[PDB]
Design a binder for this molecule. Structure first.
Ligand SMILES: [Zn+2]
Lengths: 48, 94, 191, 272, 51, 54, 287, 277, 70, 56, 172
């Protein structure tokens, strides 16, 4: 994560960089505590 | 009125029609072509006018009957050639 | 009652008359407003349409339950041409035929504020057809009474046959706006 | 209904016909196939106008392809042994637009001109086998050809050799089966010669047809009377015992063993 | 005619089959398995066929 | 309901991209997708064309 | 105005399906629907359609109930499905026009000012396209004849996107005609051309006979076009055309003759090759 | 019970055209729709019409059915003359084969739970190059079917083994989680004529001559190429006869083209000279 | 039907092809190519694509699927 | 987004997309011709890869 | 009466769609659906047009459309199926029926069951029955009972579409 997009209060709308591939804007799924992302915390990501 | 077979109009024919001596039939056909009414050409060495076109106009019932008769003859010709070809090529029509 | 009604509006140029204040146009406007809201106040699922009997009939709103759109498309009706009662009533019949819920009884509430330049024989024939096809016509007769109230009376009597209370004919003599009579009339009194 | 059709085969018993008609006058594919076959068998060789009308009407009026197939075989059986009294029905069927009914027409040609070598019927079938759009009808055309030519078995290799080398696998399979029906219980050497290459055909159902046709031709034969019988027994065994070979080819090989050893080596398939 | 028609048909049928990648075998480990690197992506092990 | 439709079609795995170049034919875009690519667009889309500067 | 209307195979099949699915359950003669498509210059491209409930009295000829609420809702759904397609007129599967047609066009003009009525004839004829397209025009006639709201022809064609060619080709592969000129096919094409020319000339003659005997009024546009056709008839007895025709016929037949000679030589060469092959086979069999 | 290996999904002409159009009307996104049809008995699934579904971002999944849309359009179709069922769902795979992947199995499980005969049709509109339509119909295999010691689908007719499967589908399990039902398109006699109208050539095209300049250029070019082939043919025949084909075959095709062109144009010319005077 | 087959071949020689460098001639009817995508494939070249001019290191269009040099 | 390269037969053009790959592609009929010459930025169709309309 | 496997199609009739044109208000449509001797009367002419609607498509094997035996009974029964719009007594006189029954007193009697052409009725959602003539000739026609015997076609009742497996987020 490189920019938490200000979190827009609700609906944080995280962002991520998969490096050589691309730069995506992403949500949280099944994650219990949607704060433990720390804006650089090397988060998880799905394929499609 | 004249069909395409002999649509060659002679200067003497024009003169015997609308009354002008044959030294300004050239100008009459000139103005006719210029106004856009009749297309074609003038071949005055042999004193003839090849009209290849005419400004279509509104006709009468008699003239439409004339056209109907000509269509009848044309249809007879077409059907004759149609039958000839279909009868002589019966074995190679898929 | 589960019934589908087809409000027919006469938008003929005779609607310009001001003998029903403010003008017959707004008199019909108010009448349609009241009748549509009353049909809604009945069991709501019932439906109301809209037809205009202009020079040749036209259909404004096919059967829909929300009266808002009927009223909105009624507001723009303007006076043009003359009336065609037979064509209007048959087109209304077609509109009823294409009704989603076939239970809804067939009713046609027609405002007939114009001389009906039709023939009595044709009117009685059409009445016979509607009687066989189960259509109940409620005519609001306001205008050229003496010219056509005879034909309308024959029409509605034929519809009623011998005991056919379904079809009604309410003649409104010139007076106040064309609602006060309707709010208390046999067509609307039961509703 | 299949059993009752078999039992009353030939007999035109009106009671059985009515029961089978009542069963067919429902719509289940499974019941309809058997009902159609049973109707045909019960009315076999009777040209009953009522039966033909009922069957063709129901065939055009149903929506189940299986019932249509059963009715096709049934209509064909109805015009059994009636050489030229079928021409009307044959023309109607062969001109119809439902491919199952066109197949009905070809089976009708076969069962009408059964074993009469009628060149009219052979010309009809051979024309369709090349000018039809449904391979299911082309195959039926070739098989019917087989039925037509069985009082003159020598001739069938002639008509079928040209078909057997065709690019249409269905026509190939029909050629194999026509050879079988024609030269059934005759061990015709030319027939076996034509079938032998087809056993190595890249299409499984043509392989199956070749195996079954060989079985029908060689039924009840010894080595002396036919030289390739052991060759084909070994070929059936190899096809069955292979692991790469296709399921339907294995089916053909199994049925071929059964046919070849039919009836404890004591039965022959003689159409006459 | 049949021969030429059939040849064209088989040509179409076999030519409608998807191609195959070309890589270089780093080392043939075990029978029927080969470690082969296929350009430009990384290197995979294979399931060598029977032919 | 149209807003609801736009919301439903605005799922949120968007790809971050640039707007490298702009053009008028209406407004268009020549965006450069971070997945290194250059994609042209006739209808700029949900962006209100707030001058959409390169 | 619009000059050309290119209809699509999907539209045609949809109309056929509508007609069948209503005729099976009843007997309505006409079936009526809306056409969806896009413009490109003055070339309408009809690429979809959908049925709209219709019902009319075939006696009165002015009582009908095309359902505009259904039209609007259905168009909303197809707008959601695909948006580059707006209502571009209507269609009805009746072999000929009807009195209602102008009123129905007035209704549909609410949703498209440029309405194109395509009378898709389900019945398969063997000479013409199944689509004939019309557009409503009211204008003061130049000849001073009283003016009324009547239809005018718009040229029609059938064309297809590649996504539909892939389908039509597959569906018709069984009864397809080779997309190459086999001499038999070309002679067939010319015979069919003569068929069509005869049919059209018969139509023109029938119309002219009706006009002359008076059962129909005179249409100045039609008379104009016919006399222009006669104007365009060519002459063949003219000498410097017979000369040219003979010249090019002779050139073409020199090419034909050379072709025939080459074919003869090749045939003889093949015969020799086969005779030699058979001779070798016979000699080897003998030895 | 079992599903016979003769079952066929008769896809009508209209359905096929709609499917292909919707596929190439949304490639390289995926598209989905329903297949209104009729379960005839046990061997037939008639797909009479198809039914686009609005693109809804979530690819093609259960949430992509939009109940309000489907219900309202089914009612409207009912009153316009389509009182038909919903026999399965089609969904395009833009260019990456004709099989299923995970979400497809989940969605098809939903459809089967609704009614356990619904097919799922997959169309690859990019690989559907003209002359080959890549459409395959599928249905699932019960978890207690291939594990309980039973084959997925019985076989009573030789019909179900006339079409071979594709390795593309095999890899993803064309026989581990789902079937492959045959298609067998159903064409009336009227649809075929209406489609023939697509390329039907007009009588004008039948009776119209070829530009004489271009025709003469074509004659000249073909005759020259044929001269070259004739020189090569002389060389080849001499060489082969001395020491004991491409020239002959090329010469034959070129003679064919020349003669067909010349005869056709010449006959058209005579026909016109007689018909138009 | 032969005419239909020939037309199907002429069709396989499609328009939307993708360009790439034909590398070598592996065998009869088959060869190895390297697309402009940067990856190399092994395919079967259509009949009579001028195997005279299909020299190694050649510029050649390929069928998008099957990568067949056509 | 890509550039024509060589202008094959007037129904075909070699176009190099941005990411590098080069395809022989069609030419949209209304697009007209003679405006696409080597180096002409074009908006290739995403799937059929047809030159839909040029660009500056 | 009821061959095994076929059941009377009462439970699948929804009153939301049933109707009967040209019926005397004294005797309603509810009369024909009780098995009691409660009848339905014709209003104006010797004709009647009933219409019944089913929730799910059904297959009709036989019909029990019977009346009294006093000369006031149906004679010519034209059966159409799956009508998009309610029809009229003018289309009912020319439209080609899906069935064209001509009842006789035997069928009319309480023990009469008329079997239809099963095949043409393999998917029925709405049935319109036009009684065109009375057994003899009576200005008023009367119907005593009417019910269909058949089987229901398995229904794919949409709006039941739900996630039977998986999460709620998979797209593709
Ligand atoms: Zn999928």
């Amino acid at each position: 994560c490189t920019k938490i997009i200000n979190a827009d209060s609700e609906d944080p709308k995280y962002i991520i960089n998969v490096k050589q591939f691309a730069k995506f804007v992403v949500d949280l799924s099944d994650q219990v505590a949607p704060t433990d992302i720390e804006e650089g915390m090397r988060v998880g990501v799905d394929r499609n | 009125t004249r069909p395409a077979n002999h649509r060659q109009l002679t200067f003497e024919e024009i003169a015997k029609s609308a009354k002008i001596t044959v030294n300004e039939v050239e100008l009459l056909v000139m103005k006719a072509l210029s106004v856009g009414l009749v297309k074609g050409s003038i071949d005055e060495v042999d004193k003839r006018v090849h009209m290849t076109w005419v400004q279509p106009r509104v006709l009468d019932l008699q003239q439409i009957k004339g056209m109907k008769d000509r269509l009848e003859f044309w249809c007879t010709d077409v059907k004759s050639m149609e039958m000839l070809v279909e009868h002589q090529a019966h074995d190679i029509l898929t | 009652v589960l019934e589908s009604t087809m409000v027919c509006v006469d938008n003929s140029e005779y609607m310009r008359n001001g003998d029903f204040l403010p003008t017959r146009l707004q008199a019909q406007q108010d009448a349609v407003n009241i009748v549509c809201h009353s049909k809604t106040r009945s069991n709501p699922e019932n439906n109301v349409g809209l037809i205009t009997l202009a020079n040749d009939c036209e259909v404004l709103t096919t059967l829909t339950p929300d009266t808002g759109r009927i009223l909105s498309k009624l507001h723009t009706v303007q006076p043009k041409g003359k009336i065609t009662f037979c064509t209007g009533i048959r087109v209304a019949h077609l509109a009823l035929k294409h009704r989603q819920g076939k239970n809804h009884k067939m009713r046609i509430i027609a405002f007939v504020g114009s001389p009906v330049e039709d023939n009595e024989k044709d009117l009685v024939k059409l009445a016979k057809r509607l009687k066989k096809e189960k259509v109940n016509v409620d005519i609001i007769n306001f205008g050229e009474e003496e010219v056509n109230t005879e034909k309308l009376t024959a029409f509605v009597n034929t519809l009623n046959g011998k005991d056919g209370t379904g079809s009604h004919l309410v003649t409104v003599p010139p007076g106040p706006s064309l609602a006060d009579a309707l709010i208390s009339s046999p067509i609307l009194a039961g509703e | 209904s299949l059993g009752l059709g078999l039992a009353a085969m030939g007999t035109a018993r009106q009671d059985v016909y009515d029961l089978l008609k009542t069963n067919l006058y429902q719509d289940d594919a499974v019941t309809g196939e058997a009902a159609g076959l049973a109707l045909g068998l019960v009315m076999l060789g009777s040209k009953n106008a009522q039966a033909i009308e009922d069957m063709v009407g129901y065939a055009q009026e149903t929506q189940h392809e299986k019932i249509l197939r059963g009715l096709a075989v049934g209509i064909a059986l109805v015009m059994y042994g009636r050489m030229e009294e079928a021409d009307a029905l044959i023309e109607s069927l062969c001109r119809d637009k439902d491919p199952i009914l066109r197949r009905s027409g070809m089976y009708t040609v076969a069962m009408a001109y059964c074993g009469s070598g009628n060149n009219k019927a052979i010309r009809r079938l051979l024309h369709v086998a090349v000018s039809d759009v449904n391979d299911d009808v082309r195959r039926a055309a070739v098989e019917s050809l087989g039925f037509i030519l069985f009082r003159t078995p020598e001739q069938c290799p002639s008509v079928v050799s040209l078909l057997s080398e065709s690019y249409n696998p269905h026509v190939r399979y029909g050629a194999a089966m026509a050879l079988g029906i024609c030269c059934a219980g005759t061990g015709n050497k030319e027939a076996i010669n034509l079938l032998e290459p087809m056993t190595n055909d890249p299409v499984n159902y043509v392989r199956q047809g070749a195996l079954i046709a060989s079985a029908l031709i060689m039924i009840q034969q010894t080595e002396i009377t036919c030289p390739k019988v052991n060759q084909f027994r070994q070929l059936y065994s190899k096809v069955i015992n292979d692991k790469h070979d296709d399921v339907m080819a294995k089916f053909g090989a199994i049925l071929a063993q059964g046919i070849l050893d039919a009836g404890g080596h004591n039965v022959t398939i003689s159409l006459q | 005619l049949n021969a030429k028609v059939r040849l064209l048909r088989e040509e179409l049928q076999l030519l409608q089959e998807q191609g195959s990648y070309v890589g270089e075998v780093v080392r043939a480990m075990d029978k029927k398995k080969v470690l082969v690197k296929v350009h430009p992506e990384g290197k995979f092990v294979v399931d060598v066929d029977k032919n | 309901e149209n807003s609801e439709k736009i919301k439903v079609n605005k799922t949120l795995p968007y790809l971050v991209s640039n707007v490298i170049e702009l053009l008028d034919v209406g407004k268009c875009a020549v965006i450069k997708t971070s997945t290194r690519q250059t994609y042209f667009l006739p209808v700029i889309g949900l962006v209100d064309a707030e001058k959409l500067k390169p | 105005a619009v000059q050309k209307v290119v209809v699509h195979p999907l539209v045609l099949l949809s109309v056929v399906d509508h007609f069948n699915r209503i005729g099976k359950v009843g007997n309505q003669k006409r079936v009526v629907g809306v056409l969806l498509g896009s413009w490109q210059k003055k070339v309408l491209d009809v690429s979809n359609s959908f049925a709209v409930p219709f019902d009319e009295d075939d006696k009165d000829d002015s009582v009908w109930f095309l359902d505009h609420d259904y039209l609007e809702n259905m168009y909303g759904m197809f707008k959601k499905v695909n948006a580059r397609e707006r209502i571009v007129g209507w269609y009805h599967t009746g072999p000929k026009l009807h009195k209602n047609d102008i009123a129905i066009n007035e209704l549909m003009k609410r949703y498209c000012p440029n309405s194109v009525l395509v009378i898709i004839d389900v019945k398969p004829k063997d000479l013409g396209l199944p689509t004939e397209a019309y557009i409503s025009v009211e204008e003061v006639h130049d000849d001073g004849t009283p003016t009324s709201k009547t239809f005018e022809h718009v040229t029609s064609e059938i064309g297809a996107e590649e996504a539909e060619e892939v389908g039509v080709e597959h569906l018709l592969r069984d009864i397809k005609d080779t997309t190459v000129g086999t001499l038999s096919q070309r002679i067939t094409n010319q015979v069919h051309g003569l068929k069509g020319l005869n049919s059209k000339l018969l139509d023109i003659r029938s119309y002219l006979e009706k006009v002359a005997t008076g059962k129909l009024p005179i249409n100045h546009q039609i008379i104009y076009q016919l006399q222009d056709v006669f104007n365009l008839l060519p002459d063949v007895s003219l000498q410097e055309f017979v000369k040219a025709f003979y010249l090019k016929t002779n050139d073409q037949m020199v090419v034909v003759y050379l072709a025939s000679l080459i074919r003869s030589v090749v045939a003889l060469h093949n015969l020799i090759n086969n005779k030699i092959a058979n001779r070798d086979a016979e000699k080897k069999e003998g030895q | 019970p079992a599903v016979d290996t003769a079952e066929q999904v008769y896809i009508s002409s209209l359905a096929l055209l709609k499917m292909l159009k919707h596929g190439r009307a949304g490639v390289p996104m995926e598209v989905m729709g329903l297949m209104l049809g009729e379960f005839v008995d046990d061997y037939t699934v008639r797909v009479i019409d198809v039914f686009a579904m609005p693109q809804s971002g979530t690819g093609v999944s259960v949430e992509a059915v939009d109940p309000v849309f489907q219900a309202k359009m089914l009612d409207m179709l009912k009153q316009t003359g389509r009182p038909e069922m919903v026999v399965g769902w089609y969904h395009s795979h833009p260019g990456f084969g004709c099989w299923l992947s995970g979400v497809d199995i989940n969605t098809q499980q939903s459809f089967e739970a609704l009614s356990e005969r619904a097919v799922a049709v997959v169309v690859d509109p990019i690989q559907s190059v003209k002359g080959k339509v890549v459409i395959d119909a599928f249905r699932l295999i019960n978890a207690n079917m291939m594990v309980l010691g039973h084959e997925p689908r019985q076989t009573t007719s030789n019909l179900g083994h006339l079409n071979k499967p594709s390795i593309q589908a095999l890899i993803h399990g064309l026989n581990r989680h789902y079937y492959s039902i045959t298609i067998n398109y159903r064409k009336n006699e009227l649809e075929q004529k209406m489609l023939l109208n697509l390329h039907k050539k007009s009588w004008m095209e039948g009776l119209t001559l070829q530009d004489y300049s271009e025709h003469c250029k074509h004659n000249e070019s073909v005759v020259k190429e044929m001269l070259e082939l004739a020189k090569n043919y002389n060389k080849a025949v001499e060489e082969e006869d001395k020491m004991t084909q491409d020239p002959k075959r090329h010469l034959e095709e070129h003679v064919d083209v020349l003669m067909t062109s010349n005869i056709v144009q010449c006959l058209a010319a005579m026909l016109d000279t007689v018909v138009f005077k | 039907e032969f005419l239909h087959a020939q037309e199907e071949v002429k069709r396989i020689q499609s328009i939307p092809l993708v360009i790439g460098q034909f590398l070598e001639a592996v065998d009869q009817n088959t060869a190895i190519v390297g697309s402009t995508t940067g990856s190399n494939y092994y395919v079967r070249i259509l009949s009579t694509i001028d195997r005279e001019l299909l020299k190694p290191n050649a510029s050649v269009a390929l069928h998008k699927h099957s990568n067949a040099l056509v | 987004v890509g550039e024509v390269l060589k202008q094959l037969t007037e129904e075909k053009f070699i176009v190099k997309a941005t990411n590098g790959p080069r395809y022989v592609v069609g030419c949209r009929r209304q697009l007209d011709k003679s405006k696409l010459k080597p180096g002409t930025r074009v908006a290739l169709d995403m799937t059929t890869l047809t030159i839909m309309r040029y660009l500056p | 009466d009821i061959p095994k496997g076929y059941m009377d199609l009462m439970p699948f009739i929804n009153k939301a769609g049933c109707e009967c044109l040209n019926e005397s208000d004294e005797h309603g449509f509810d009369n024909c659906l009780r098995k009691d001797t409660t009848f339905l009367e014709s209003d104006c002419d010797e004709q009647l047009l009933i219409t019944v609607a089913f929730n799910q498509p059904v297959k009709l094997y036989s019909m029990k459309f019977q009346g009294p035996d006093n000369g006031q009974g149906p004679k010519y029964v034209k059966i159409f199926i799956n009508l998009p719009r309610s029809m009229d007594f003018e289309e009912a006189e020319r439209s080609e029926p899906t069935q064209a029954l001509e009842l006789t007193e035997d069928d009319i009697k309480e023990d009469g069951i008329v079997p239809l052409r099963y095949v043409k009725f393999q998917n029925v959602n709405s049935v319109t029955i036009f009684v065109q003539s009375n057994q003899g000739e009576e200005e008023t026609t009367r119907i005593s009972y009417f019910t269909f015997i058949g089987t229901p076609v398995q229904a794919t009742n949409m709006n039941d579409f739900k996630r039977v497996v998986g999460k709620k987020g998979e797209s593709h």
